[model samples]
Structures are given as C-alpha cells and as structure tokens.
Target: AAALEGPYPVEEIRLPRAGGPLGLSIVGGSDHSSHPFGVQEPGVFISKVLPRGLAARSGLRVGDRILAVNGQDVRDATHQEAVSALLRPCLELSLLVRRDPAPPGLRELCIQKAPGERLGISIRGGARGHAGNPRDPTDEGIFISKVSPTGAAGRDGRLRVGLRLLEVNQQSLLGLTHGEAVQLLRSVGDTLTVLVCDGFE
Candidate 1:
C-alpha cells in the first residue's frame, strides 16, 4: 500500500510494565477523513498515545495508522476486531504503523433482500473542487444527487441529499468514477451497507 499520509519512524517496545494496557488506543479509519489521520483505508488510526507510556516510549505517535499488530494484518479488520487482535496475551508488540491517513457518518442499511436489488437511489460524481476528475487531493467521494421517495433508502432514516457517499459495501469510492460507484452498488448481492460522509455544505 502507498503511504497516503506519512512516513513515521518506527521503534519497538515491551508492554505491561506497570499493569497498564498497551498505553495506546486507536480509532478506526472509517470514523475519520478530514482529520490529519483521516486516511480511510482498512487500517486502524492511532488516535491516542500515552506520552510516558509504552506507545510513546516505543516511538508511536498520534495520527499514525496501525497497519498491523503482532505481525498479524488488521488492515481490513473492524475496530473491535483490531483491538482484540492487538490485546492478545503477549508481552511483545511489533506494530506496523503508518501516519495520518483518514472515514465518517456511517450507517448499515438492509436496502434490499436479494442480489441486484434496487435501493431506489441515484448518484453523481462531484469533486471537492476538482473539476472533471473525480480523484482529488481532498476528494469528498461520490454524491447522492437523487433518491426515489418510494425507494428503500427514502423510507430509511437519515439518508438524504448532499451526503457524500464514502463506501458501498465496505469498499472505498474515493478513486472510482460515478459509473464505477453505481456498478459497485449494483454488484452487491444483498444488504448494502453504505458508509456516507456528511458533506461540508
């Protein structure tokens, strides 16, 4: 994977010195995007690091993305799963971390009951100030330009116009074209769980 945010220095350290936890905590990338560590890949973003704790002593820093823990890749794991993977019974901690990368406004909806089910939604690609190209340095992802009132999404709560569509079935729409986004949504067999980010406007 590319270093979307940073090239932070790495240092190893032991854990459980004074009956404390790992001396660090993480926020899943799906929860942030505009933040410094808002690179919304599948890894866990380092939200906190105890200055005097093992994380700090071992060269961990805030905004660092935890790509892996204890040699096991937690890049695609959920926040809870990532925590469980790190908190395993072990005194040695070897973290694969990157810095500042980003996710937010998430909801999982059962929009359909079968594959290729229409959720009565239409989307358009809108750049975050980047004209013509969907990919931009500060791309806001896709846009939900229209929603059918009688469709599943319209009946669902909170999904609305102007919301930036981030993920379709856990896949990032950051670099895809509007057609690609539609294809992704259409490819889902059932139960599309969209992770929509609230637009700045």
Candidate 2:
C-alpha cells in the first residue's frame, strides 16, 4: 500500500480553567493567507501561548492545528466562528489538535540572520582528524559544542550545547564529514533551518 500522508496525528487536550482568558492566540481558518507553518488547510491553529498561562500549562503549543472544539468539529470553521466557539462561556475546553511528531527532545529551529551577521556557534563530532575514518560509528553525528551569546544563533535563544544537528537547510548531515557539514551550513543563505535533538550519551 502507498504511504498515507493525508492527515497528521491528532491529540485531545482538555483544559480546565478557573475563569478568565485562555491565554493563547490563534490564526488561520478561512483566510489561509499566512500561516507560520505555511499550512493550506481550512482550520484554526494556535499561534501563541503566554508563558505560565492556562494554555501553556495545558500543553498547547504554537503551530498546533485545531481539528475540533468542545466535541464539535471545527476543522473547516471560519476564523470568526472558531473565535466565537472558543469564547463561549465555559470553565473547561476540549480540543482536538494535530501536530507533527518529533522524537523525544527534538526541536526544530529557524534562525534568521541579517546581512553580514555570524552564526556564532561551534560544533563537535563528524570526522575527526585529517584522513580520519569517515565510517567510524563511534564518532557521533554533529552536535553543538558552544554558542556565543552575542552571535545570531545565541540571540535566537533556541540553540544550545549538547544538541545533535540532524539537518541543515533541510539537508541531512548524517554520515557527513565535519568539514562537509560546515561547508553545507555556510552555503545556506541568511535563513537557516535546522533540526536538532538531544546529544547521545
């Protein structure tokens, strides 16, 4: 059978509130004009969650696509309709959301650098010395060794040491030499999209 990529995994989130705002922002729905993840679906998505707020504590994150609200399917609800549904007077909210799954401790980061800006990060692993064995399994994949606080990556506040670099600019870094990985990263333009995960023990 052909692989199915139609819909993502859905999660049910029930949030109990004592009263007040849900402390979150949502976007998309009928407009579909602009979405952070470039989604073209006619659905509402969580755009922001205030720190330590009800939504944050409820495990709602940015980019979560809402499929249903209060046991009512709102997958094709308009922006105004979804807002009205969420604003209904209630002490609890039951929502079904769709999100792409990542392995534990994995994070996707997009770093935007201006002209003449530096990434300011150091990486470890990859091929060791000159003429080093490229097939050595002991040499783990590339990982961030340091991040300069004053650099572009550091200023972004998402990258940190001990995170293995999985992809740079959507290119896999697996089995690549240290030099090769560095060159690939440098070849990218101002915007850098990287997939990172917790470093191996």
Instruction: Work out the TM-score per prediction.
Output: 0.45, 0.46
Which residue pairs of candidate 2 clash?
none
Native-structure RMSD, model 2: 13.1
Candidate 2 on 1-201: residue-level lDDT in tens? 112355776778988867767888776676432122323444577755778988899999866878788877776678789899898877679888878433347677899987998898887766443222133344436778778987789889888876777679867665577888889888889999997766643
Best by TM-score: 2
User: What's every prediction's RMSD, in angstroms?
Assistant: 10.6, 13.1
The lDDT, on a scale of 0 to 1, for candidate 2 is 0.70
Worst 10 residues of 2 by lDDT: 32-41
On a 0 to 1 TM-score scale, where does candidate 1 land against the true structure? 0.45
How high is the CA lDDT of each candidate model? 0.60, 0.70
**Which candidate gets the maximum lDDT versus the true structure?**
2
